[PDB]
Amino acid sequence: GIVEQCCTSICSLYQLENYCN
Amino acid sequence: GIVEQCCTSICSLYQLENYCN
Amino acid sequence: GIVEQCCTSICSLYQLENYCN
Amino acid sequence: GIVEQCCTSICSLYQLENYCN
Amino acid sequence: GIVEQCCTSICSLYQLENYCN
Amino acid sequence: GIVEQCCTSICSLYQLENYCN
Amino acid sequence: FVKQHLCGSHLVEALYLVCGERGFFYTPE
Amino acid sequence: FVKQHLCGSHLVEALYLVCGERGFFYTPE
Amino acid sequence: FVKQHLCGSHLVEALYLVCGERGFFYTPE
Amino acid sequence: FVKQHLCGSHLVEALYLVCGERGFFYTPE
Amino acid sequence: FVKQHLCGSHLVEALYLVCGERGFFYTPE
Amino acid sequence: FVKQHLCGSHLVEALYLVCGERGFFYTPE
Numbered sequence: 001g002i003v004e005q006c007c008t009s010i011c012s013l014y015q016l017e018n019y020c021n
Numbered sequence: 022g023i024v025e026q027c028c029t030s031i032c033s034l035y036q037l038e039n040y041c042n
Numbered sequence: 043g044i045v046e047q048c049c050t051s052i053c054s055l056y057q058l059e060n061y062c063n
Numbered sequence: 064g065i066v067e068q069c070c071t072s073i074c075s076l077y078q079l080e081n082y083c084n
Numbered sequence: 085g086i087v088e089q090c091c092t093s094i095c096s097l098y099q100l101e102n103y104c105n
Numbered sequence: 106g107i108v109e110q111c112c113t114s115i116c117s118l119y120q121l122e123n124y125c126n
Numbered sequence: 127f128v129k130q131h132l133c134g135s136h137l138v139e140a141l142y143l144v145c146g147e148r149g150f151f152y153t154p155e
Numbered sequence: 156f157v158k159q160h161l162c163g164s165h166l167v168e169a170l171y172l173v174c175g176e177r178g179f180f181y182t183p184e
Numbered sequence: 185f186v187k188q189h190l191c192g193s194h195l196v197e198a199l200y201l202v203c204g205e206r207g208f209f210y211t212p213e
Numbered sequence: 214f215v216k217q218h219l220c221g222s223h224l225v226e227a228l229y230l231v232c233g234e235r236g237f238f239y240t241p242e
Numbered sequence: 243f244v245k246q247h248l249c250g251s252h253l254v255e256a257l258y259l260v261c262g263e264r265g266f267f268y269t270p271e
Numbered sequence: 272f273v274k275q276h277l278c279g280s281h282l283v284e285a286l287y288l289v290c291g292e293r294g295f296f297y298t299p300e
């Protein structure tokens with residue numbers, strides 16, 4: 001998932017928006 | 022400037038982009 | 043909630059465990 | 064000591080309590 | 085102490101050196 | 106430059122003073 | 127463990143230290 | 156924005172910047 | 185993206201998250 | 214709590230969360 | 243080097259930057 | 272002071288400690 005992606009690959013701030021409450 | 026825009030007022034990551042090279 | 047318990051009041055790392063999955 | 068342990072191995076928050084004043 | 089010197093008053097990295105081992 | 110130096114080698118706080126406004 | 131005021135970024139950093147790979151939910155106010 | 160390479164606590168700080176006091180979920184798999 | 189108060193260290197950390205290898209300038213007041 | 218893997222400044226932040234304004238000693242060997 | 247208000251977590255982070263492997267003592271109030 | 276090994280956001284935090292509200296430039300090459 002995103003936690004793994006951002007650490008082993010790269011991720012975007014637009015993906016992190018999906019984890020807001 | 023950036024303090025009035027983002028610290029004393031509020032800003033999001035879009036206004037921050039204004040201070041990128 | 044968590045802000046009243048730990049930010050406006052004080053809490054230790056034990057109360058934080060309440061918000062772990 | 065603890066500084067080395069926590070970085071090359073793992074350490075616990077119960078060990079860090081020992082370094083409080 | 086260090087809070088009065090650097091938090092409530094202001095200090096630079098030179099006064100911080102006073103609290104190095 | 107300094108950003109690369111401090112990450113691949115070591116740098117000093119006296120070098121970072123050069124980047125103040 | 128000391129009781130202290132933990133707010134904003136510092137509060138979710140604390141949640142990361144205590145929960146880690148368990149995950150957490152930060153749902154203020 | 157630039158793409159991100161965020162490990163450990165650095166991703167929780169980035170989620171705080173994106174979501175703030177909306178709240179968020181930190182959900183390792 | 186939430187609008188929030190970003191100050192001091194946390195504001196330049198945010199500039200690092202959004203600008204990264206582009207660089208930035210932090211020129212307050 | 215989860216076990217910790219803390220290097221550099223991250224262990225000083227964890228000691229601040231455990232000890233706070235009690236104070237602490239950061240003592241590399 | 244600028245003189246500034248350094249408090250709490252940010253003050254011990256500063257002590258880590260200036261003292262590093264020397265170690266330090268954080269003994270407030 | 273100790274010499275520094277600072278990568279990523281850690282160098283921006285160190286520039287904030289050295290320069291503060293003087294401001295600074297973060298300028299990767």
Ligand SMILES: [Zn+2]
Binds near residue numbers: 165223281
């Ligand atoms: Zn780090």
Ligand SMILES: [Zn+2]
Binds near residue numbers: 194252
């Ligand atoms: Zn802070």
